[PDB]
PDB file of C-alpha atoms in Angstrom:
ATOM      1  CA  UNK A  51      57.175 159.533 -54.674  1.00 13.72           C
ATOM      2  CA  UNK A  52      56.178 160.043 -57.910  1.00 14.93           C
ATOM      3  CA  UNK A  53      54.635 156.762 -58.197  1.00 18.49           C
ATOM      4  CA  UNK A  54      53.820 153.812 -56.004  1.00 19.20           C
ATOM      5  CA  UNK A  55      53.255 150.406 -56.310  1.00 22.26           C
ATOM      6  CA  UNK A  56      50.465 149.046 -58.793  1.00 24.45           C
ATOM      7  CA  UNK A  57      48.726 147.179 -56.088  1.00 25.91           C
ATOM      8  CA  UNK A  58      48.063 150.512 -54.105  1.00 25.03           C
ATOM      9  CA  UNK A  59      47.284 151.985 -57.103  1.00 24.15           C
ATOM     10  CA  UNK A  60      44.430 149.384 -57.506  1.00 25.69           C
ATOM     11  CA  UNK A  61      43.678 149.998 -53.827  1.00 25.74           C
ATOM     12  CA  UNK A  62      43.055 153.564 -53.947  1.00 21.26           C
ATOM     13  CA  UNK A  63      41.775 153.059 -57.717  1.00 21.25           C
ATOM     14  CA  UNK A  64      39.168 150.565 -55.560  1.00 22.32           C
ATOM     15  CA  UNK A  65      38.604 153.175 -52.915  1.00 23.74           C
ATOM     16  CA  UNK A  66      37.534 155.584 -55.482  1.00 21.30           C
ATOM     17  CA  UNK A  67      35.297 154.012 -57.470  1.00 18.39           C
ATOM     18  CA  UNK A  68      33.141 152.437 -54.730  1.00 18.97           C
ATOM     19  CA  UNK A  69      32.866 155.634 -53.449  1.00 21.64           C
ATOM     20  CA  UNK A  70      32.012 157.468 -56.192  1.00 25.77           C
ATOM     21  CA  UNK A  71      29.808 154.927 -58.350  1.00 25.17           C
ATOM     22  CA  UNK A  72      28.491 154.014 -54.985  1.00 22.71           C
ATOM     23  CA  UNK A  73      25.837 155.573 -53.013  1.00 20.35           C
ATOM     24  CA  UNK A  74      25.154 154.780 -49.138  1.00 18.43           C
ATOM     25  CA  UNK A  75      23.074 157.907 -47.540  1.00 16.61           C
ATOM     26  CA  UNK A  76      25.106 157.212 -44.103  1.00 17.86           C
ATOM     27  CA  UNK A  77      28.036 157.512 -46.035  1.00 15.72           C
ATOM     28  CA  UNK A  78      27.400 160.048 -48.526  1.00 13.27           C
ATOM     29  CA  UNK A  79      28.900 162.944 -46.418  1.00 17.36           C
ATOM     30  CA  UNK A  80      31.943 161.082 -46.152  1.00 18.05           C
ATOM     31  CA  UNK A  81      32.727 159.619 -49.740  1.00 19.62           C
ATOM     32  CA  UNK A  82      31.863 162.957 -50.886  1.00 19.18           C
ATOM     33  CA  UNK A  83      35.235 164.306 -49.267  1.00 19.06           C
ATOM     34  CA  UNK A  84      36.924 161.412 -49.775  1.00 19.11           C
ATOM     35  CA  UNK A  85      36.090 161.616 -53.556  1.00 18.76           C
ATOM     36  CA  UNK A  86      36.906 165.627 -53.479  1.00 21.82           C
ATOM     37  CA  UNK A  87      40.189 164.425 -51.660  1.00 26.27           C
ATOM     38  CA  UNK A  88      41.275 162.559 -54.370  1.00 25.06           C
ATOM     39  CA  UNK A  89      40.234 164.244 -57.267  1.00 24.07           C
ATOM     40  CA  UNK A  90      42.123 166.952 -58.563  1.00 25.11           C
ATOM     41  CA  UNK A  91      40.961 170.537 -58.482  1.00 27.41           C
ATOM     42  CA  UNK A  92      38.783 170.487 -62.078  1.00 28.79           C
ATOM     43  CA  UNK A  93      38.036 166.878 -61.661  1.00 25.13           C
ATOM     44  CA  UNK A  94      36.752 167.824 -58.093  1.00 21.77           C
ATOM     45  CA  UNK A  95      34.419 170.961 -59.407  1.00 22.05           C
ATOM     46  CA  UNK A  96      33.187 168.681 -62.581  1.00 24.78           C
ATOM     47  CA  UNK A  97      32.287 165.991 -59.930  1.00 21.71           C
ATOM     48  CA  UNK A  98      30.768 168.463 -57.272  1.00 22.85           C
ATOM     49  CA  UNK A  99      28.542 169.559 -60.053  1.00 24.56           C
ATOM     50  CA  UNK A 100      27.538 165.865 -61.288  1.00 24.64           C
ATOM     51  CA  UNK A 101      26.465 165.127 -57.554  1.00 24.36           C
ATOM     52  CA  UNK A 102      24.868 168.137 -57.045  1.00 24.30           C
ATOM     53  CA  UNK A 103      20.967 167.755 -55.745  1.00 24.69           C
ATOM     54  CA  UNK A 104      20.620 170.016 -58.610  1.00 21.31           C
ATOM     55  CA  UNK A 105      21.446 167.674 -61.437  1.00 21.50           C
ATOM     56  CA  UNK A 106      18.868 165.132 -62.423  1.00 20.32           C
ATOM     57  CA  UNK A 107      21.747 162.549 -63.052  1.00 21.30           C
ATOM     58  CA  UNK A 108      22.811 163.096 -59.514  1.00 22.48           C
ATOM     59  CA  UNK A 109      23.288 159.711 -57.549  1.00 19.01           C
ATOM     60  CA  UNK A 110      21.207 161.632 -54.778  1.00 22.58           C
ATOM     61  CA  UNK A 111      18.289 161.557 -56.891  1.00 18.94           C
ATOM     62  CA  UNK A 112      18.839 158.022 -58.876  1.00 17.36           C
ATOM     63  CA  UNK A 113      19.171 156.665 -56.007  1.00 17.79           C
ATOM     64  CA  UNK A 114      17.369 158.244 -53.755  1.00 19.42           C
ATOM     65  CA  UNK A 115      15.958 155.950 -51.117  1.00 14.30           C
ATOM     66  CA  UNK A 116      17.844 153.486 -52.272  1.00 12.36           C
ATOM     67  CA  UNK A 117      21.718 151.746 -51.717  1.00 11.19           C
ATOM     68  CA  UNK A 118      24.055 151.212 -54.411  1.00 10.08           C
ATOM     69  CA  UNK A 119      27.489 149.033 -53.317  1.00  6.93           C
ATOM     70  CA  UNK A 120      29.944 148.460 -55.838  1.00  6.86           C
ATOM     71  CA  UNK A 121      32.113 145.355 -55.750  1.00  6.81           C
ATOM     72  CA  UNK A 122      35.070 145.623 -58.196  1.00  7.51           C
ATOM     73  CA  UNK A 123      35.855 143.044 -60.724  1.00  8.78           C
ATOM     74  CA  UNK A 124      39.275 143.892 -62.113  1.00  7.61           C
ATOM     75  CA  UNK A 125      41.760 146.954 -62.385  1.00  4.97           C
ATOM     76  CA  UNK A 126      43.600 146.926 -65.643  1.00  4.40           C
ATOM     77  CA  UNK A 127      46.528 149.448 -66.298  1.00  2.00           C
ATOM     78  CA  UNK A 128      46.275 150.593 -70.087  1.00  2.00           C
ATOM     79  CA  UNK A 129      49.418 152.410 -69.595  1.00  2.00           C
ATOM     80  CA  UNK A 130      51.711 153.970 -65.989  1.00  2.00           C
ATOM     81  CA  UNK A 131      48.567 156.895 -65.714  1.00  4.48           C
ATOM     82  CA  UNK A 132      44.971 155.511 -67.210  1.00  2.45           C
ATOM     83  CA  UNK A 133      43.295 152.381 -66.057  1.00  2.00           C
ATOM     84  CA  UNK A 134      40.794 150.365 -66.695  1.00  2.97           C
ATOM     85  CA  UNK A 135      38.286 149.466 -63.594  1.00  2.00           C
ATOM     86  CA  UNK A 136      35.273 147.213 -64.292  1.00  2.00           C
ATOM     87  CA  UNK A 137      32.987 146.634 -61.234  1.00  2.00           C
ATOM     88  CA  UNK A 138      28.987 145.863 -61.031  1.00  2.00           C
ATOM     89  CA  UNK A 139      26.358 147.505 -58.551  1.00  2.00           C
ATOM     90  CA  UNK A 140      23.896 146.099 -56.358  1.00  2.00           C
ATOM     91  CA  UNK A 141      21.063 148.312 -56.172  1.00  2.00           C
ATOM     92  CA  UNK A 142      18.872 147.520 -53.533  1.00  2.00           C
ATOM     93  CA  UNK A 143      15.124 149.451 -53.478  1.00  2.00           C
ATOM     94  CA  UNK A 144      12.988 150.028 -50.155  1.00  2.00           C
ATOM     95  CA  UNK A 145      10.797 147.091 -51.093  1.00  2.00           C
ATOM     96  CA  UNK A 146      14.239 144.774 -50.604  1.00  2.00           C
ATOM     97  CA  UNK A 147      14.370 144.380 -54.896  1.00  2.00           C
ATOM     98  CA  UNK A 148      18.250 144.229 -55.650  1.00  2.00           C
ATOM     99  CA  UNK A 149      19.453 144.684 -59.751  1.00  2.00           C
ATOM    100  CA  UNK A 150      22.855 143.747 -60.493  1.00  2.00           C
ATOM    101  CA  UNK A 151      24.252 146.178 -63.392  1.00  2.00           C
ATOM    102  CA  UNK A 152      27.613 146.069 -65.088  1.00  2.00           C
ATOM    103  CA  UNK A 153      30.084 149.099 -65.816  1.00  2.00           C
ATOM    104  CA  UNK A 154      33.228 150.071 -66.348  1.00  2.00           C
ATOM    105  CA  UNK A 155      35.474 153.686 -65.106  1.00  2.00           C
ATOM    106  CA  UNK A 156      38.498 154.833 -67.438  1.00  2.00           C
ATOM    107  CA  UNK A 157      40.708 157.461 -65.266  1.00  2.00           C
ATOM    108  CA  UNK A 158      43.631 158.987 -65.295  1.00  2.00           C
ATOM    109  CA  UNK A 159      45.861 159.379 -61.784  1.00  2.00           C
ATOM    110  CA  UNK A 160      48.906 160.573 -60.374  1.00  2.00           C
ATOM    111  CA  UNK A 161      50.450 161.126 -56.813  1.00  3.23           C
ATOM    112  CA  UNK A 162      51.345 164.556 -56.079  1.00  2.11           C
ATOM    113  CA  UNK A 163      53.523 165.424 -53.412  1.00  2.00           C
ATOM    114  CA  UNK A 164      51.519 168.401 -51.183  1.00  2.00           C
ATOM    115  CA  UNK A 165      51.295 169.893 -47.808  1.00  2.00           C
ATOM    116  CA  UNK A 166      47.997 169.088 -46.466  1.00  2.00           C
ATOM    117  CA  UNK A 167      46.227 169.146 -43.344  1.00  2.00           C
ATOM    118  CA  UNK A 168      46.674 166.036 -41.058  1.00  2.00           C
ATOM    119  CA  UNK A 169      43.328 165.216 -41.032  1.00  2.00           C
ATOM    120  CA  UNK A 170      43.402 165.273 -44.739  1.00  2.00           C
ATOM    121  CA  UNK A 171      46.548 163.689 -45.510  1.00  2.00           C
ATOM    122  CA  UNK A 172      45.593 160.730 -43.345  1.00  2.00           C
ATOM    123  CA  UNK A 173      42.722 159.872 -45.797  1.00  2.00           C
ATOM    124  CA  UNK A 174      44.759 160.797 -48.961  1.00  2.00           C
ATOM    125  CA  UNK A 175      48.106 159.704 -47.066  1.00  2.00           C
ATOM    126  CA  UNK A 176      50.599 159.515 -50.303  1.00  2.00           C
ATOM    127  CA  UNK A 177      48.596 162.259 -52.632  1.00  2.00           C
ATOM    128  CA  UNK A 178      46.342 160.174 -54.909  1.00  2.00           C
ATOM    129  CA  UNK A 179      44.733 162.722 -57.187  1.00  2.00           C
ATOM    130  CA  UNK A 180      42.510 161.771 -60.152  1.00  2.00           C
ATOM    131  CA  UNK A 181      42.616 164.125 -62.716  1.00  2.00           C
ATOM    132  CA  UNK A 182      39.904 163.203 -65.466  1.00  2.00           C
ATOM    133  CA  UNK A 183      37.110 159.882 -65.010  1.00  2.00           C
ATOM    134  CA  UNK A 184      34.507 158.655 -66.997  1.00  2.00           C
ATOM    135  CA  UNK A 185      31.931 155.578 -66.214  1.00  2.00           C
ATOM    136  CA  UNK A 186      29.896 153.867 -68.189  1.00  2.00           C
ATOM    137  CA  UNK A 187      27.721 151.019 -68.549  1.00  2.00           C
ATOM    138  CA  UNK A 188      28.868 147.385 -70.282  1.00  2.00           C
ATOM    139  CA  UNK A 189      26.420 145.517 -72.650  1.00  2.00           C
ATOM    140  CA  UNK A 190      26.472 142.949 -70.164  1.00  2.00           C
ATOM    141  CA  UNK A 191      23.220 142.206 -68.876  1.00  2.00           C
TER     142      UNK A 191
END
């Protein structure tokens, strides 16, 4: 389809902003594709260069011996394209400190109907493609 129910919207929506705002070094490899799975071609390169070990911003080097889990707090749709995801992170440092910060995505999605690889389309199953993303931090402290 075109589009799909709101609910797996919010479930992929989930899926993709754990993973990205997230950071897990056993799971890096994997959220990395899953993240360039479901971005679209430009949001993929703009994201590939964000994560780059290259920039300083990188959540390789912000968090670099360190976890970051995100646990989502609501999934708002602003209109059938562009929500609204607010979620916190745990950060958790090598000497067991965790800091609980506050943030909010704004993206814009659509399903596109492709020919993929199995392997591929399994993870992405119905073509969930973000196409432009933004995160930032609430005044919530």
């Amino acid at each position: 389809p075109n589009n799909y129910d709101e609910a797996i919207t919010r479930y992929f929506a989930s899926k993709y902003v754990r993973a990205r705002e997230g950071f897990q070094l056993s799971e890096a490899e994997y959220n990395f594709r899953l993240i360039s799975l479901l971005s679209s071609p430009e949001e993929q390169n703009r994201f590939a260069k964000w994560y780059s070990g290259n920039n300083p911003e990188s959540p390789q080097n912000i968090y670099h011996n360190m976890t970051a889990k995100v646990t989502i707090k609501s999934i708002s749709f602003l209109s059938k394209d562009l929500i609204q995801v607010r979620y916190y992170k745990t950060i958790r440092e090598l000497n067991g400190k965790e800091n609980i910060s506050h943030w909010v995505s704004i993206l814009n999605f659509s399903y596109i109907n492709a020919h993929i690889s199995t392997e591929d389309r399994l993870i992405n199953p119905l073509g969930f493609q973000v196409s432009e993303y933004r995160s930032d931090p609430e005044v919530i402290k």
